[PDB]
Design a protein around this ligand. Structure first.
Ligand SMILES: *C(=O)CCCCCCCCCCCCC
Lengths: 207, 40
């Protein structure tokens, strides 16, 4: 269990483009995918500038804790796909020992400023001695679809990475009733060059 | 101006002469883990 606090574990996360060739034929391209050991640490102060500030922002959330709920994911995104019959989606799955009502906030940021927020409420399903939470085929917001379109129309890979340096995503999963931070995941991005998508996962620490 | 201007963000890298975006410290210059820029 990599991305896991004491109360919640994210077992699956993927962003994808699904193209319908014909009514029985679907081609799915994964942009990014995640599917007990101790991870390497990153000083959170090194990335505060790339995420929303003020009350409810990353610093505020981290200081309120708990410290074990905070992670940084570095993605190498696979942009090699044919860009009517397209579905851009995000899917994720979580497990908890506790029966909770959870809220998943996803904030897309440019130069550390919030551009768009998507907020989803999830209820528990009992499964194999624990509770499961699934966000299944959540539509990617139009900003993201537009962003990917503009990225692919860039003629050089170094241009794509330059843009991505200032594009980030902040995912905050919260217990709806108690407001406890169950998971807070900061996402940073490069383009994959190896023919696909890869990731490093880090723990966010105070220093 | 606006920091969240999508067209401005892409214009900054497509046409560097007319770039109008906040200036930032490149990630590679920061105090980050050794393999942060080396894919597994
Ligand atoms: C709008 O709905 C924003 C929700 C963001 C969900 C996270 C999906 C991650 C997208 C992968 C980035 C690929 C582009 C480099």
């Amino acid at each position: 269990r990599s991305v896991a606090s004491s109360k919640l574990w994210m077992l699956e996360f993927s962003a994808f483009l699904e193209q319908q060739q014909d009514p029985d034929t679907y081609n799915k391209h994964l942009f990014v995918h995640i599917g007990d050991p101790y991870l390497a640490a990153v000083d959170i102060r090194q990335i505060y500038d790339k995420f929303p500030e003020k009350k409810g922002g990353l610093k505020d959330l981290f200081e309120r804790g708990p410290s074990n709920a905070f992670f940084l994911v570095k993605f190498w995104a696979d942009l090699n796909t044919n860009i009517g019959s397209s579905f851009y989606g995000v899917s994720s799955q979580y497990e908890s020992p506790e029966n909770m009502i959870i809220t998943c906030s996803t904030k897309v940021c440019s130069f550390g400023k919030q551009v768009v927020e998507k907020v989803e409420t999830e209820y528990a399903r009992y499964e194999n001695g624990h509770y499961s939470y699934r966000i299944h085929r959540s539509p990617l917001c139009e900003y993201m679809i537009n962003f990917i379109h503009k990225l692919k129309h860039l003629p050089e890979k170094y241009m794509m990475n330059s843009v991505l340096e200032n594009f980030t995503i902040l995912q905050v999963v919260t217990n709806r009733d108690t407001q406890e931070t169950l998971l807070c995941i900061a996402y940073v991005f490069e383009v994959s060059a190896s023919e696909g998508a890869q990731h490093h996962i880090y723990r966010l620490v105070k220093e | 101006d606006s920091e969240t201007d999508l067209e401005a963000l892409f214009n900054a890298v497509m046409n560097p002469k007319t770039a109008n975006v906040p200036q930032t410290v490149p990630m590679r210059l920061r105090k980050l883990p050794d393999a942060f820029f080396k894919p597994p």
